[PDB]
């Protein structure tokens, strides 16, 4: 039973999964993604250090492979992250001149999005921009450009591909009482009021056991920012309890603007957190109790 087909039947857009050429060419990953998922999300091949390892010298081979595989198999594509502090080459973080960095950032955004224009459903434009107390995270963009780097990034992305949905994303947005959750809602409200084209908030749900229950209140709070969409991505759950996974799915179903869920890989041994067995398929590529519980809940 395909959880993507079942979640579409309930009115959502997709159940997706993070992957890349390394996974699609080994084991049973390709067969499972074909059968059970409706959207793919490159784990590393679209990040800055992979795509622009030297300034103006782009490398698209891995990203091209993923996009072509998705189109051939009828899958939606989400891609990112265009601007964040992870996967960032030193040549970028060493820039100290504001105009130089604005132009570098705009060029990185425009080049990636133009190459795949019309083919990408969702771009993660800005990621992990907030500290745990709700202040903005001090990365090179904030240090050199200032808080305007976020509006500039989204305005540039919107001009490059008006078809794509443009997201901001962060982690630890899983509790409605946590300062970070309330801060991103307030800031996104203000940005949208100023005309900034933020289409979505993506919640990076790398969850500890038992945190699914709190998502039932956190996700509606994120939806109150008034973006056209919200999504769940990078989802995994330590221990992979059915209770946590079903709670996360029910939160999605309860929030009308939540378009879908993307899990953080297929099989446990390929997770960065493999020792906590946090995914929906085990090391033999067999569906786990959590997978069957999602199927049963959606039916």
Numbering used by the authors: 4 to 302
Provide the authors' own sentences about this structure as they appear in the paper:
HG3.17 was evolved from HG3, a higher-activity mutant (S265T) of the in silico design HG2 that was engineered post-design to reduce the active-site conformational heterogeneity observed by molecular dynamics analysis of HG25. Over an evolutionary trajectory that yielded the HG3.3b, HG3.7, and HG3.14 intermediates, a total of 17 mutations were introduced into HG3 to produce HG3.17, resulting in a catalytic efficiency increase of approximately three orders of magnitude. To evaluate changes to the HG3 conformational ensemble along its evolutionary trajectory, we solved room-temperature (277 K) X-ray crystal structures of all HG-series Kemp eliminases, both in the presence and absence of bound 6NT.
